[PDB]
Structure formats: structure tokens, C-alpha cells
Enzyme design. Structure first.
Site, PDB file in Angstrom:
ATOM      1  N   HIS B  41       0.804  -1.217   0.000  1.00 54.37           N
ATOM      2  CA  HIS B  41       0.000   0.000   0.000  1.00 54.37           C
ATOM      3  C   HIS B  41       0.841   1.274   0.000  1.00 54.37           C
ATOM      4  O   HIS B  41       0.275   2.371   0.101  1.00 54.37           O
ATOM      5  CB  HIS B  41      -0.989   0.019   1.170  1.00 54.37           C
ATOM      6  CG  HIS B  41      -0.361   0.201   2.514  1.00 54.37           C
ATOM      7  ND1 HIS B  41      -0.097  -0.857   3.356  1.00 54.37           N
ATOM      8  CD2 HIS B  41       0.013   1.316   3.184  1.00 54.37           C
ATOM      9  CE1 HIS B  41       0.441  -0.405   4.474  1.00 54.37           C
ATOM     10  NE2 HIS B  41       0.517   0.910   4.397  1.00 54.37           N
ATOM     11  N   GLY B 143       4.359   6.042   9.835  1.00 53.34           N
ATOM     12  CA  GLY B 143       5.711   5.900   9.343  1.00 53.34           C
ATOM     13  C   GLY B 143       6.377   4.594   9.720  1.00 53.34           C
ATOM     14  O   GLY B 143       7.427   4.262   9.148  1.00 53.34           O
ATOM     15  N   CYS B 145       5.263   1.586   9.190  1.00 49.93           N
ATOM     16  CA  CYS B 145       4.942   0.488   8.290  1.00 49.93           C
ATOM     17  C   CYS B 145       6.190  -0.006   7.578  1.00 49.93           C
ATOM     18  O   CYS B 145       7.048   0.783   7.178  1.00 49.93           O
ATOM     19  CB  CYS B 145       3.896   0.925   7.265  1.00 49.93           C
ATOM     20  SG  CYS B 145       2.272   0.934   7.973  1.00 49.93           S
TER      21      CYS B 145
HETATM   22  C1  LIG Z   1       1.603   2.552   7.451  1.00 48.16           C
HETATM   23  O1  LIG Z   1       1.020   2.479   6.168  1.00 48.16           O
HETATM   24  C2  LIG Z   1       2.604   3.690   7.470  1.00 48.16           C
HETATM   25  N1  LIG Z   1       2.720   4.421   6.375  1.00 48.16           N
HETATM   26  O2  LIG Z   1       3.314   3.854   8.470  1.00 48.16           O
HETATM   27  C3  LIG Z   1       0.413   2.868   8.383  1.00 48.16           C
HETATM   28  C4  LIG Z   1       0.799   2.598   9.838  1.00 48.16           C
HETATM   29  C5  LIG Z   1      -0.335   2.713  10.852  1.00 48.16           C
HETATM   30  C6  LIG Z   1       0.034   2.515  12.334  1.00 48.16           C
HETATM   31  C7  LIG Z   1      -0.242   4.040  12.564  1.00 48.16           C
HETATM   32  C8  LIG Z   1      -0.892   4.117  11.136  1.00 48.16           C
HETATM   33  N2  LIG Z   1      -0.712   2.015   8.025  1.00 48.16           N
HETATM   34  C9  LIG Z   1      -1.852   2.466   7.488  1.00 48.16           C
HETATM   35  O3  LIG Z   1      -2.060   3.647   7.235  1.00 48.16           O
HETATM   36  C10 LIG Z   1      -2.910   1.394   7.190  1.00 48.16           C
HETATM   37  C11 LIG Z   1      -3.107   1.226   5.668  1.00 48.16           C
HETATM   38  C12 LIG Z   1      -4.422   1.889   5.304  1.00 48.16           C
HETATM   39  C13 LIG Z   1      -5.052   2.387   6.597  1.00 48.16           C
HETATM   40  N3  LIG Z   1      -4.220   1.827   7.668  1.00 48.16           N
HETATM   41  C14 LIG Z   1      -4.508   1.671   8.970  1.00 48.16           C
HETATM   42  O4  LIG Z   1      -3.751   1.083   9.723  1.00 48.16           O
HETATM   43  C15 LIG Z   1      -5.824   2.254   9.512  1.00 48.16           C
HETATM   44  N4  LIG Z   1      -6.476   1.212  10.280  1.00 48.16           N
HETATM   45  C16 LIG Z   1      -7.716   0.802   9.917  1.00 48.16           C
HETATM   46  O5  LIG Z   1      -8.342   1.298   8.972  1.00 48.16           O
HETATM   47  N5  LIG Z   1      -8.183  -0.196  10.709  1.00 48.16           N
HETATM   48  C17 LIG Z   1      -9.400  -1.009  10.463  1.00 48.16           C
HETATM   49  C18 LIG Z   1      -9.265  -1.744   9.136  1.00 48.16           C
HETATM   50  C19 LIG Z   1     -10.617  -0.096  10.431  1.00 48.16           C
HETATM   51  C20 LIG Z   1      -9.539  -2.015  11.593  1.00 48.16           C
HETATM   52  C21 LIG Z   1      -5.651   3.569  10.327  1.00 48.16           C
HETATM   53  C22 LIG Z   1      -7.028   4.127  10.687  1.00 48.16           C
HETATM   54  C23 LIG Z   1      -4.872   3.319  11.619  1.00 48.16           C
HETATM   55  C24 LIG Z   1      -4.899   4.602   9.486  1.00 48.16           C
HETATM   56  C25 LIG Z   1      -4.229   0.411   5.064  1.00 48.16           C
HETATM   57  C26 LIG Z   1      -4.007  -0.067   3.629  1.00 48.16           C
HETATM   58  C27 LIG Z   1      -5.003  -0.596   5.923  1.00 48.16           C
END
Ligand SMILES: *[C@](O)(C(N)=O)[C@H](CC1CCC1)NC(=O)[C@@H]1[C@@H]2[C@H](CN1C(=O)[C@@H](NC(=O)NC(C)(C)C)C(C)(C)C)C2(C)C
Ligand SMILES: *[C@](O)(C(N)=O)[C@H](CC1CCC1)NC(=O)[C@@H]1[C@@H]2[C@H](CN1C(=O)[C@@H](NC(=O)NC(C)(C)C)C(C)(C)C)C2(C)C
EC number: 3.4.19.12
Lengths: 306, 306
Positions: B41, B143, B145
Site C-alpha cells: 500500500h 511511518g 509500516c
Molecule cells: C503505514 O502504512 C505507514 N505508512 O506507516 C500505516 C501505519 C499505521 C500505524 C499508525 C498508522 N498504516 C496504514 O495507514 C494502514 C493502511 C491503510 C489504513 N491503515 C490503517 O492502519 C488504519 N487502520 C484501519 O483502517 N483499521 C481497520 C481496518 C478499520 C480495523 C488507520 C485508521 C490506523 C490509518 C491500510 C491499507 C489498511
């Protein structure tokens, strides 16, 4: 999100551990530039421990009695000396993996990472705090002596601890890298008192702030308090007094959460007087005091290191 | 003596972290030989997250859209591909710091070290367990990830986890290094259920053994029990059933302490039914389940790694 007892990456310290042997004893040394640092009781036999005269013991050791070994490569000692409780072995090869480093003597309540080693080889890393009685609660077995505690500041490793000895209740004592013990301990096998261990109040507050930052808010109450009134209660549950400095240090955490320090003190007050009634905070059923306000800022904002 | 939540030394993994940028997104990659591994992603914008079609999104990326960076040195992508949920970037320079490594898919209840990174740079290391619901309780910010979980076997790093996403209660989900998620999670921002989290009974027993090895014996009672009778009680407090394998795995700890597993089960039984009445065990007021029997043997006997 999330909060974990987190250690510094250990890569820069791993390359500095060697193995030091003198007669029968083998332990760990710290090899920086062309000097190896190790606990001076490496020159003792099991019997010498009860009442060592280190000067006299040292008199009958020459450079060739000290076997220093970095992996399979084998370094040779061209000079030795005693600085307080550490031995400084001068070797013929500067460590090509010497990081930028300082020696610092830390203050009680500060935290640091320990790289526990055996036979000059890293076994594991964990975070701990200098207790107010100048002990640490570590995890050390026979052979771990010479293992070091450290912090990192970007590219600069700050060495602050070297492990020497264990006290009855599985607590640990050692020196700074200049050989001075933390606390009143001496390196001989004779009965020795550690004082009462108190709770690091400012660390508890920073951990309560970390709770709140991570959404764990149930202990937040509606009261407030004064610094004199809080200290009157903290001091009865064996807690360190809180000073205006401490309040100033907590400023960044207070500003991020919108909760004033004195308000947080009133919540802590109630937790000490009523217990936590069965809940947990940040997964813990006790009040945690081994996160400094800096550790919380660093972890809840993402400080990296080279 | 002493018992600490201990991570593996991270030196061999630090040299494998790089920074991966695609358009706006920056995250961490794992650089081994001439391949960089990162979450797929990274090719998404904030809007794509709600319902990404990764195939279609990938169609409009060429090798030159991917900025890979190891420190200040800058690697160039000569090929990309998608393997499940990870992206494999083929680069022009084999990592000169590639350790001996394997990719393993771990089983629930196993533990591992996480090197949390930001912008390709190590920030800290901690130990965690794969929960029975295939989440981990980590400490990850924006960050983080691409950060990886790993074990060490002497000289061989076993990569088992790559961080992808957070779920509501500050718990974390991710993949193995082949891109397959642990659990039923998918990498999109849409509501997703994590199941109930249960306690890893065999890990609790190993920690009780570590208590006893470190002289913390007060919960040792005079009763015994049967494996069927214990499981009847464990299953009501949301505990994993104990099997004969588990008993066999605990053999080394049972043999060192002279306490039979079923006897230990009877002590645990009472701790679940009466609580711990205010004491602690190994400094904890909760039953700890993130030490495997191997972690206990390793820590209470001193296993080192190259
Ligand atoms: C990494 O992508 C990054 N760039 O560091 C990031 C790390 C997380 C831990 C703090 C934020 N991950 C995401 O952004 C991740 C990518 C999108 C949305 N993501 C989420 O983790 C979201 N969780 C979420 O939607 N949880 C459910 C599915 C509702 C249970 C956040 C709301 C935490 C951003 C994808 C592809 C899943
Ligand atoms: C290191 O020397 C080593 N070789 O690894 C060793 C590590 C400790 C931690 C497990 C054993 N330290 C000692 O052996 C240390 C050296 C003698 C005796 N030492 C002790 O730590 C003893 N403690 C002790 O006597 N405690 C007091 C002073 C009674 C409170 C042991 C009983 C644990 C061996 C000296 C010079 C202090």
C-alpha cells in the site's frame, strides 16, 4: 499507537563487546579505540572474593596473563591499569567499529538499555531504570559481568553502566565506565546493605500521560491538588517528592494532552489511596515508573537514531 | 538472577532497513541481497485506502516511481512485482550487510523481536507475542509500516513479521515476508473484526516456572490436578487448552525446578479462581503470557548469538 517497554537498537554496541580471560575467570569487556574496559575482579579467584586486595592481586599479573578475544580474532595486551573498579587493558588494535561515544554518570530515575552478554557475545537487550537506591532490576547470570548499559543521541552512544554484582533479592549493582560504583557498594563478597527502593513519581506521571495519549482515560478524575498536598500523600506510599522542575519537564506531555500536571497528580493521589480496583492501565495492574518523560515523548512521537 | 522482557540484539537487522518512497507515501523496506521488501500500500494515496484495486494501482507505476534510499546512498529499482500483500523491488546493488536469513511464518503464541523504524532508521526494539487472534500488541506510529519482526538462531535471522496496519484498540496486524497476512485481515481501510483474545496458557506456565527459578514461590500450593480438570477451568477464564505436547515442551523447566507440570497447573488454577490478592509475581500484578518456554530457558540459562 501502543506503548511498549522499548530498548535502543544495539547494533553500535554489539561490535564493541569482547571476551576477557584472566587465569580462570572469563567475562565481558568493552573495546573502544585501543582500550578494553572490564570489571577489575576478573583478576580474582573464587577465594579472593571474600577480601580482595586489588593492588596486591594486580601486582602479580603481567600483560600476557590477560586473554582478550574479539570473535575468533585474538587481541594482545600491551598495557594494563586500574581506574577505580575497572581495569583498562591497552591493546594493539583500535576497534574499527568504535562508534562516536561518551561516558556519562547517570542520575537516579534515568533509564537506559542493557545489552546482556556472555563470553563476549550479545544474548539480549532490555530497558531498565537506575533505582533511587542506586540498584537496577536486571536479568544477569554468571558470565554477564562486564555487560554495559547505554543510551543513544542520534549517532552518539552514551555508556553509563557496567555490570559487576548481584544483591540478595535479584537486584544488581555496578559502575560507570570510569569505575565508580553507583551507590555505596564495593566489589567484594561481604554483606552489604541496599537502602529502601522508592517509586520515581515523575516517571509514574509520564506513564499516566502515555496512558491518556493512548486513550486509557478511566483514572482521570474531576479533582485537583497542590504540589505540597500531593507530596504529603506521595511520601507516605514511599514516593519521590515532586518538584517544580519535574512539573516543567512534564510540560510537553501536559501540552499534548491538555491535562495539567497538578490535575494528573490528583488522579495519581486517588490511585494510591484506592488502588486500581481491578482494571489495568496500559496493560499493567501496577503503577509503572521506568519510563522517563523523555522516553514517553520519544516513543509517542517517533524519535529515530542513525 | 532476574527476569526481564528481553529482545534479541538488533544489529544484524538494522543494516537491512531502507526507506521506500512512492509519490507521497514514505515507509520502511527490508533490503536483503538485491531485493527490497515493503508493504504494497506504499503505492496508495490517502483516498485509495478505502477501496484499493492494487493490480490497477500498480499498472500505472514504473520502476522510476519508487525511491529507495539506504542512508544517504540511493538505490535504483530495475524491477518491481507484487507477491500477495508485499511489493518486491529489485535493485541494482546487493546489500553488503545481508545476514544469513530465512522467512518463517510463525504460529500463534510464539514471540519475536520488533525493530520499530521510521524513514528507514531504527528507533527501538521490543519483544512481543503473536496473539491467538493473529494480532500483536505493539508500539507503532505513522511511518512505522514496513518495520519487521524477527528471531535469531545463532547466526541466522528468521524474519517472521512485517507491520501494515492498526486496529481500533491499539493492536496491530501485518504479514509474513511472503505477503500473507496473519489472520483474516486485508489491507484496506474498511471495518474489520478481530476475534476474542485468549491467554496463552503454556506461556503463563513457563513464566510461573521462571518465577520459581528466581525464588518467587508463594503461589506454590499443596494440591494437584488433572489435565482435563484444569482445561475445564482454564476454558472459563478464556485460556488456551493445555495439551500433552505443552506438557512435553515444559519438561526442561519442570526438571530444573522439580515441580511437575500438573502441580503447576493446580497453582495456576487457584490464581485464576482467587486472583493474586495483592502480591506480584516477578514484579507483575497480572499473569504474563508473552514468554515462551524457550524464552524462559534461553534467559534463565544464557543462550548467546553470533
Ligand atoms: C503505514 O502504512 C505507514 N505508512 O506507516 C500505516 C501505519 C499505521 C500505524 C499508525 C498508522 N498504516 C496504514 O495507514 C494502514 C493502511 C491503510 C489504513 N491503515 C490503517 O492502519 C488504519 N487502520 C484501519 O483502517 N483499521 C481497520 C481496518 C478499520 C480495523 C488507520 C485508521 C490506523 C490509518 C491500510 C491499507 C489498511
Ligand atoms: C561476574 O563477576 C561474572 N563473572 O559474571 C559475577 C556476576 C554475578 C551475577 C550472577 C553472578 N559477579 C560476581 O561474581 C560478584 C563479584 C564477587 C561476588 N559477586 C557477586 O555478585 C555475589 N554477590 C554478593 O556477594 N552480594 C552481596 C555483596 C552479599 C550483597 C554473588 C553471591 C552473586 C556471587 C564480587 C567481587 C562482588
Amino acid at each position: 499507537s501502543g506503548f511498549r517497554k522499548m530498548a535502543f537498537p544495539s547494533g553500535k554496541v554489539e561490535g564493541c563487546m569482547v571476551q576477557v580471560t584472566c587465569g580462570t575467570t572469563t567475562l565481558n569487556g568493552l573495546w573502544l579505540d585501543d582500550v578494553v574496559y572490564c570489571p577489575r575482579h576478573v583478576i580474582c579467584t573464587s577465594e579472593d572474593m571474600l577480601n580482595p586486595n586489588y593492588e596486591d592481586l594486580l601486582i602479580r599479573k603481567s600483560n600476557h596473563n590477560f586473554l582478550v578475544q574479539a570473535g575468533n580474532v585474538q587481541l594482545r595486551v600491551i598495557g594494563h591499569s586500574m581506574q577505580n573498579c575497572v581495569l583498562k587493558l591497552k591493546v594493539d588494535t583500535a576497534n574499527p567499529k568504535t562508534p562516536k561515544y561518551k561516558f556519562v554518570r547517570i542520575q537516579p530515575g534515568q533509564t537506559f538499555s542493557v545489552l546482556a552478554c556472555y563470553n563476549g557475545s550479545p544474548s539480549g537487550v532490555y530497558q531498565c531504570a537506575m533505582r533511587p537506591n542506586f540498584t537496577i532490576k536486571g536479568s544477569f547470570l554468571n558470565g554477564s559481568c562486564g555487560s554495559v548499559g547505554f543510551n543513544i543521541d542520534y549517532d552518539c552512544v552514551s555508556f553509563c553502566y557496567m555490570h559487576h554484582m548481584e544483591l540478595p533479592t535479584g537486584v544488581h549493582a555496578g559502575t560507570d565506565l570510569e569505575g565508580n560504583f553507583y551507590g555505596p557498594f564495593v566489589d567484594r563478597q561481604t554483606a552489604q546493605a541496599a537502602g529502601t527502593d522508592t517509586t520515581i513519581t515523575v516517571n509514574v506521571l509520564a506513564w499516566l500521560y502515555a496512558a491518556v495519549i493512548n486513550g486509557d482515560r478511566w483514572f482521570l478524575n474531576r479533582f485537583t491538588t497542590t504540589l505540597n498536598d500531593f507530596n504529603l500523600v506521595a511520601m507516605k506510599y514511599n514516593y519521590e517528592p515532586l518538584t517544580q522542575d519535574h512539573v516543567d519537564i512534564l510540560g510537553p506531555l501536559s501540552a499534548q494532552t491538555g491535562i495539567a500536571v497538578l490535575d494528573m497528580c490528583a488522579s495519581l493521589k486517588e490511585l494510591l489511596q484506592n488502588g486500581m480496583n481491578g482494571r489495568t492501565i496500559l496493560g499493567s495492574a501496577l503503577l509503572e515508573d521506568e519510563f522517563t518523560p523523555f522516553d514517553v515523548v520519544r516513543q509517542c512521537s517517533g524519535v529515530t537514531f542513525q
